[PDB]
């Protein structure tokens, strides 16, 4: 499913990620924007061999079973094909747990790059909230 930019906003807000750690919604949308460009089915592969899954490109490395990324930890306890699912539940608990470890949303390289420090509440500004 590729999301809308108000759709996923309202989709965030619904599972708990407004000021989740004290990240505002905007952070969120952004970081997905240029994670995923919103595609639930995004893949992309790693040079160590693992991948990342979803709509915040989530790693196997760490986060999830993908059962092609040896000597990797599963700490979301899920197979990774369950963050490409239409239904964002999945990835946005797992999310949950990343941005709880201690680094906040520096996890996302592309949060880090392109979304820190800027103007991140127009990623929401218009929508129905
Ligand atoms: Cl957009
Ligand atoms: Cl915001
Ligand atoms: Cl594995
Ligand atoms: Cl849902
Ligand atoms: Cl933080
Ligand atoms: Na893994």
């Given amino acids: 499913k ?5 759709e996923l906003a309202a989709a965030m807000k619904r599972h708990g990620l407004d000021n989740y ?4 919604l905007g952070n969120w949308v952004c970081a997905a924007k240029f994670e995923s460009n919103f595609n639930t089915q995004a893949t992309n592969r790693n040079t160590d061999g693992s991948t990342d899954y979803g709509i915040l490109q989530i790693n196997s490395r760490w986060w999830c079973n993908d059962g092609r990324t040896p000597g990797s930890r599963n700490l979301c306890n899920i197979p990774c094909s369950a963050l490409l699912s239409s239904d964002i539940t999945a990835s946005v608990n797992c999310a949950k747990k990343i941005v709880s470890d201690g ?12 979304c820190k420090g800027t103007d991140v509440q127009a990623w929401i500004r218009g929508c129905r909230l």
């Fill in 21 to 24: 750690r004290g990240y505002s």
């Fill in 2 to 6: 590729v999301f809308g930019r108000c």
């Fill in 103 to 114: 680094n906040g949303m520096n996890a996302w390289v592309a949060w880090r790059n392109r």
